[PDB]
């Protein structure tokens, strides 16, 4: 049995950490996401890969919104994505968004 709402996280990434004395975390794969595309329930995916995985500043917002019972806030930019952009900017790349 494993179960978790909120617990410890990694120091390298912001992902939940799972071991014996940890609550465990549930590893969500790839074909799973393919079937999520097959429904096309994309707001679920935006819920999954952002506020549940890597963006720290959203977790306080959605958690506190659940505390007050207010509206679900909009999922902000996955900051883990922007980490790749900084890696590209490390290697002589004028990358840019328009």
């Amino acid at each position: 049995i494993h179960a978790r709402s909120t617990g410890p996280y990694s120091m390298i990434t912001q992902q939940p950490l799972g071991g014996k004395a940890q609550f465990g975390g549930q590893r969500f794969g790839e074909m799973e996401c393919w079937a999520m595309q097959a429904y096309g329930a994309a707001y679920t995916l935006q819920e999954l890969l952002t506020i549940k995985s890597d963006d720290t500043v959203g977790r306080v917002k959605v958690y506190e919104a659940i505390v007050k019972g207010e509206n679900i806030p909009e999922p902000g930019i996955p900051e883990s994505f922007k980490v790749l952009l900084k890696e590209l900017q490390s290697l002589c790349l004028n990358v840019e968004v328009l």
């Binding site: 120091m11 071991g19 014996k20 004395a21 940890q22």
Partner: protein, 107 residues
Amino acid sequence: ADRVLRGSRLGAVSYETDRNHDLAPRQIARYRTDNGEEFEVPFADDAEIPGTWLCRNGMEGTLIEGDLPEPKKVKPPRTHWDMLLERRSIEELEELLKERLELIRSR
């Protein structure tokens, strides 16, 4: 060593609240580097304005103004001439250059 083990960052963690009003006022000097630049550097409104300052370039420069405090306090390097003049004399180099300059003078 796969076991649930904790390490440490360094620094501080604070749960302070956020706001965008009632902050301390400021003042802006625009320091000028050697390579013709103007860098709007915000300073706290109660502060001192120093003379030299390493800037966003990674170099130091002067102010927005033309005070020019001092181009001094630097020292010359310990050259090979000083290290020569420790163990050798002026007469040594004068007569020795009479020897060598004689040797090119006689070719």
